[PDB]
């Protein structure tokens, strides 16, 4: 169990797209951001690694290692300070992603927490929930996939703390994404991403499915809300990796060629809930999928449950 990095309260990320559709990357700005947020990505990668190792069984020390990192960042007020604004809201986006990563790890390992670990971490996760939510109170921040990624951390905090208020808030974030799906299956704000339109339909589906999957831990079936709307979106993503013809036309740009990876692992869960599971076999074959921002190994979590028991 390596030493827990410093949990600085401040974040100074750097946005790195060159165009209005945020679809072409400035490599020098990308490298600068990668270095600037390195501690935040490192924190996410490790707590998820420890949670995965805990889930393997016969390794409670790993689960305890995750809790020590979480407790350390909680006690230092990590990410609750200044969200430095350079050329966009990338610092707030990092806090959204890192809150989700931290909350998923706590949700998976909290059985091993001590009482002060429980109180320190849960108070911190709720403070992050409140801060990330306040960001979206500004109507100028359009509620695209970043809004649904915010819901990952809200929902994981809601379930881990059994907080009915936060549960209702997270349900509203999820349902806001379901409501945004058009009859043809598109998400307009993600279709505006030109060559990354398919990638961002995939990237928007991922937190919606993970939220629904966490709702199952509370016995709830969120796939019945506007039943079939999430299926149309998920099916477009799967069809898009087979043939980008539709995304090309609807987005006005030839899609960037890429295979499913990382957060695409929502399919591991969703293929178990879809009315036509075999439609997702081609995406499933690209597994296994691992993403710290979603709790770690999505392939194993889909098979064994999010919380190891
Ligand atoms: Cl600054």
> Contact 269/213 with Cβ under 8 angstroms?
yes
Query: Ligand 1 centroid to 12 CA: how many Å?
Result: 6
Q: Ligand 1 centroid to 252 CA: how many Å? A: 36
Confirm if 220 and 279 have CB atoms less than 8 A apart. no
Measured distance CA(303)–CA(306) in Å, rounded: 9
C-alpha 92 to ligand 1 mean position (Å): 13
> Ligand 1 mean position to 193 CA, how many Å?
28
Ligand 1 center–CA 84 separation, angstroms: 5
DSSP state letters, 174-242? HHHHHHH--TTS--HHHHTTGGGHHHHHHHHHHHHHHHHHHHHHTT--GGGTTTTHHHHHHHHHHHHHH
Return the domain boundaries, the chain: 27-304
- How far does the centroid of ligand 1 lie from the alpha carbon of residue 91, in Å? 10
H-assigned helices in the chain = 27-36, 38-55, 60-75, 90-109, 115-137, 145-161, 164-180, 188-191, 197-217, 229-242, 245-251, 266-270, 281-284, 298-304
Q: How far does the centroid of ligand 1 lie from the alpha carbon of residue 83, in Å?
A: 9
Report how far ligand 1's centroid is from the alpha carbon of 129 (Å). 23
Residues 297-305: contacts with CB under 8 Å, at least 24 apart: 297/52, 297/55, 298/265, 298/266, 298/268, 298/269, 299/265, 299/268, 300/52, 300/55, 301/55, 301/268, 301/269, 302/265, 302/268, 302/269, 302/271, 302/272, 303/268, 304/55
How many Å lie between the centroid of ligand 1 and the Cα of residue 39?
17
Span from the CA of 162 to the centroid of ligand 1 (angstroms) = 37
């Amino acid at each position: 169990c390596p030493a827990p990095p410093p949990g600085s309260p401040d974040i100074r990320a750097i946005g790195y797209y060159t165009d209005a559709a945020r679809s072409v990357i400035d490599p020098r700005l990308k490298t600068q951001n990668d270095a600037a947020v390195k501690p935040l990505n490192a924190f996410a990668a490790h707590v998820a690694k420890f949670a995965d190792a805990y889930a393997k069984g016969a390794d409670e020390a790993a689960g305890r290692c995750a809790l020590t990192w979480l407790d350390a960042w909680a006690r230092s007020g990590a990410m609750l300070g200044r969200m430095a604004h350079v050329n966009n809201d990338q610092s707030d986006y990092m806090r959204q992603w890192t809150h989700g990563a931290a909350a998923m790890a706590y949700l998976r390992t909290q059985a091993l927490a001590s009482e002060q670990q429980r109180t320190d971490i849960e108070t911190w996760l709720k403070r992050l929930s409140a801060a990330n939510l306040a960001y979206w109170d500004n109507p100028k921040h359009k509620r695209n996939n970043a809004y649904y990624w915010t819901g990952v951390g809200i929902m994981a905090t809601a379930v881990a703390t059994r907080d009915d208020t936060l549960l209702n808030t997270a349900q509203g974030i999820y349902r806001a994404g379901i409501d945004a799906i058009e009859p043809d299956g598109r998400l307009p704000m993600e279709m505006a991403r030109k060559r990354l339109a398919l990638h961002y339909h995939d990237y928007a589906t991922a937190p919606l499915v993970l939220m629904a999957e966490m709702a199952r831990l509370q016995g709830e079936d969120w796939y019945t809300y506007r039943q079939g709307a999430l299926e149309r979106l998920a099916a477009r993503v799967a069809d898009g990796y087979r043939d980008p013809s539709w995304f090309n036309t609807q987005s006005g740009a030839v899609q960037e060629t890429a295979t499913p990876k990382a957060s695409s692992g929502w399919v591991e869960f969703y293929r178990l809930r879809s009315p036509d599971p075999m439609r997702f076999d081609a995406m499933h074959a690209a597994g296994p999928f691992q993403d710290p921002r979603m709790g770690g190994n999505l392939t194993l979590m889909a098979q064994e449950g999010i919380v190891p028991l």
